Design a protein around this ligand. Sequence first.
Ligand SMILES: NC1=NC(=O)c2cc(Cl)ccc21
Ligand SMILES: [Cl-]
Ligand SMILES: [Cl-]
Ligand SMILES: [Mg+2]
Ligand SMILES: [Mg+2]
Lengths: 142, 128
Amino acid sequence: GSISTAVIDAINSGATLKDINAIPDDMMDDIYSYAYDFYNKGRIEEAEVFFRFLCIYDFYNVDYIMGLAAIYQIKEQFQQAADLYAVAFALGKNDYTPVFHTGQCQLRLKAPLKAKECFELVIQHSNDEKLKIKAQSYLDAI
Amino acid sequence: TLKDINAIPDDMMDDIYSYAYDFYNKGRIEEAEVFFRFLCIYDFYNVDYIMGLAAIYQIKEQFQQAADLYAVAFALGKNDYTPVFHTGQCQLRLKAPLKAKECFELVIQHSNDEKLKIKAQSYLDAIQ
Ligand SMILES: NC1=NC(=O)c2cc(Cl)ccc21
Ligand SMILES: [Cl-]
Ligand SMILES: [Cl-]
Ligand SMILES: [Mg+2]
Ligand SMILES: [Mg+2]
């Protein structure tokens, strides 16, 4: 998947498509907009292809990662979702939304201690008061 | 992948990893790089294999290449902020001090590794 592609690219250290500016920013923006068009209409499989395409071209992009992670979470591919959410967090640093969703994923993976660690991070560090309430509700059930 | 089918016994992979760090510790960077690339081809999902290849790229002053692998390494481990610390070092070398500050601050705010936080704070103290 997307993470494997990123690691293979890093191993090979040959020229990538982004290295030669093969697809301009405005064009990537358009494709991202089509990806969400598909997603918003329930065409999840088509959206997944488009987000995978975007992540092959520019893996280290929070918006593309988050779109793909959401698809995996909806498809109950919870480990794949959690891994991508953590990449998004590492790149973005100040949005705890990916940490919250990783906590949801860890609960479904039967890892409540990992989920508790996620939800506690949201409470301790997020300034999103509504997200903190949501995180607390999961903590209350654990 | 090769790991998915147990293509090489576990103890032999342990040996190859230990030989890779032996090369690294002895300054045989080109040979360490072959061995860490081999390991990451065998199992891209192994955080310590990725960290070893990232260390090679950092020592070779391929700082963005290292930082990219550190972001994957962070995700695979979820709660180990060592890759975030090293990303902070790479960002300083890339002349991105605000990004580096964000990395070191993330280590101090989330890590439970006291020795790592001490190191991260020493970098924050030096950043203008
Ligand atoms: N420190 C952390 N423990 C976790 O389980 C986790 C998940 C994510 Cl997404 C970011 C950071 C962390
Ligand atoms: Cl993958
Ligand atoms: Cl999965
Ligand atoms: Mg490259
Ligand atoms: Mg607060």
